[PDB]
Structures are given as structure tokens and as C-alpha cells.
Structure 1
């Protein structure tokens, strides 16, 4: 039993809710919140910009030190950093950005990072400003993640479409 509330159950291990991931994280304080990161950990907009803003830019400060030490992530890769005031940990995961020409096949590799964590609060990878089809992202999620994932979808219209079209 966990503290996530109001989710629709899609499969044995995948759950979905129309919610602002920032507000959901502040309420649940999950062990792991997933950020829709880029390889530079520049949290400018989308989910990343919102999460970072909620940390009063502490996420960005920590991220800049991480990059200075380690260099950029790989597309499809991830790193674990602090969750600040939102979660114990933040798993920064880089899905391919279609608006940069990146291989959508890397979306499965990106979701594989979730399997290293027993329970996660997450957005749909590569959705939103990353330019991929969110219906496809949900499909890859369900077919790749085996751990317990609670998906927050900000847009109510998109949420209803994801549920109604789910196979």
C-alpha cells in the first residue's frame, strides 16, 4: 500500500492521473519523482522548468555541479539527484526530443531507467515540448516499465484521450 490517490489502473504496474506533477510531488513526497530532462540538465521549460521552479532553482544549481563534474547525459540515459522539497530523489531521464531529430527508438531505453526503482511518480517521457506522440509514449511505458509507475498527465484533454484510446 502506498499514498498515491485517485489514479486509474491501466495494468498490473502502471497507473495514470490527470494531475500537475509538481503538486502531486508536493503532496505525496514520493521516494522518486522523474524529471523530463535534457542531456545538459538545463531545466528551462516543460516538466523540468516546472519542477525546478518549485525547488526555487536548487535543482538547477545541483544539476550544474553534476554536469561540471560528469559531463552531459546520454539520450536515453539518466542520473539520480536530490528530490529537494518534492521527493527523496529525482531521477532525471532523457527521452529523445523529436524537435531535435533524435531517434524515437531511444524512448524504450529511456523508460528502462525506471526499472531501477520500485515505485516512481513520472510524466510521459518525450511528450509535451519533446514532440513525441503521448499515446506512443504511454504504450512504450506499459511495455517497458515493470516497476510501479504513477503517471501524471497535466492536460485534462490529453488524459481523457490517453485513457479512452488505451489498449
Structure 2
């Protein structure tokens, strides 16, 4: 039993809700919140910009130190950093950005990072400003993640479309 509330159950381990991941994180304080990161951990917009703003820029400060030490992430890769006031940990995961020409096959590799964590609150990877089809992202998620994932979808119209078209 965990503290997530109001989710539709898609599969044994994947749950979905129309919710702002920022507000959801602030309420649940999950062990792991997933960020829709880029390789530079520059949290300018989208989910990343929103999560960082909610930390009063502390996520960005921590991230800049991480990059200065380790260099950029790989597309499809991840790193674990602090969750600040939102969660215990933030798993920064880099899905391919279609608006940069990156290979969509790397979306499966990106979701594989979730399997290192028993329970996660997460957005759909590569959706939104990353330019991929969110329906496809949901399919890859369901077919790749085996741990318990609670997906927050900000846009209500998109949420209804994902549910109604889910196989």
C-alpha cells in the first residue's frame, strides 16, 4: 500500500492520472520523482522547468555541479539527484527529443532506467516539448517498465485520449 490517490489502473504496475506532477509531488512526497531531463540538465521548460521552479532553482544549482563534475548524460540515460522539497530523490531521465532529431528507439532505453526503482512518480518520457507522440510513449512505458509507475499527465484533454485509446 502506498499514498498515491485517484489513479486509473492501466496494468498490473502502471497507473495514470490527470495531474500536475509538481503538485502531485508536493502532496505525495514520493521516494522518486522522474524529471524529463536533457543531457545538460538545463531545466528551462516543460516538466523540468516546472520541477526546478518549484525547488526555487536548487535543482538547477545541484545539476550544474553534477555536470561540471561528470559531463553530460547520454540520450536514454539517467542520474539520481536530490528530490529537494518534492521527493526524496529525483531520477533525471533523458528521453529522445524529436525536435532535435534524436532516435525514438532510445525511448525504450530511457524507460529502462525506471526499473532500478521500486516505485516512481513520472511524466510520459519524450512527450510535450520533446515532440514524441504521447500515445506511443505510454505504450513503450507499459511494455518496458516492470516496477510500479504512477504517471501524471498535465493536459486533461491528453489524459482522456490516452485512456480511451489504451489497448
Q: Specify the TM-score bucket, using the shorter chain as the normaliser.
A: over 0.9
How far 1:162 moved relative to its partner? 0.1
Partner in structure 2 of residue 115 of structure 1: 115
User: How does the TM-score come out when normalised to structure 2?
Assistant: 1.00
**Residues in 2 aligned to 1:163 and 1:2: alpha-carbon distance in whole angstroms:** 22
How far 1:101 moved relative to its partner? 0.1
Partner in structure 2 of residue 161 of structure 1: 161
Gap runs ≥5 in structure 1:
none
Q: Please show how residues 1-167 of structure 1 align to structure 2 within 5 Å.
A: 1-167=1-167
How far 1:35 moved relative to its partner? 0.0
What is the DSSP-based 3-state SS (H/G/I as helix, E as strand, rest coil) of the residue aligned with 1:64?
helix
Q: Deviations over 1:86-142 (max 9, x none)?
A: 000000000000000000000000000000000000000000000000000000000
**Residues in 1 aligned to 2:46 and 2:81: alpha-carbon distance in whole angstroms:** 19
Gap runs ≥5 in structure 2:
none
User: How does the TM-score come out when normalised to structure 1?
Assistant: 1.00
How far 1:52 moved relative to its partner? 0.0
Root mean square deviation of aligned Cα: 0.1
How far 1:161 moved relative to its partner? 0.1
**Residues in 1 aligned to 2:57 and 2:163: alpha-carbon distance in whole angstroms:** 34
Q: Deviations over 1:127-166 (max 9, x none)?
A: 0000000000000000000000000000000000000000
**Residues in 1 aligned to 2:69 and 2:143: alpha-carbon distance in whole angstroms:** 34
What is the DSSP-based 3-state SS (H/G/I as helix, E as strand, rest coil) of the residue aligned with 1:92?
strand
What is the DSSP-based 3-state SS (H/G/I as helix, E as strand, rest coil) of the residue aligned with 2:72?
coil
What is the number of residues matched between the two proteins?
167
Q: Deviations over 1:44-101 (max 9, x none)?
A: 0000000000000000000000000000000000000000000000000000000000
**Residues in 2 aligned to 1:75 and 1:83: alpha-carbon distance in whole angstroms:** 21
**Residues in 1 aligned to 2:139 and 2:86: alpha-carbon distance in whole angstroms:** 27
What is the DSSP-based 3-state SS (H/G/I as helix, E as strand, rest coil) of the residue aligned with 1:114?
helix
**Residues in 2 aligned to 1:155 and 1:34: alpha-carbon distance in whole angstroms:** 18
**Residues in 1 aligned to 2:45 and 2:64: alpha-carbon distance in whole angstroms:** 16
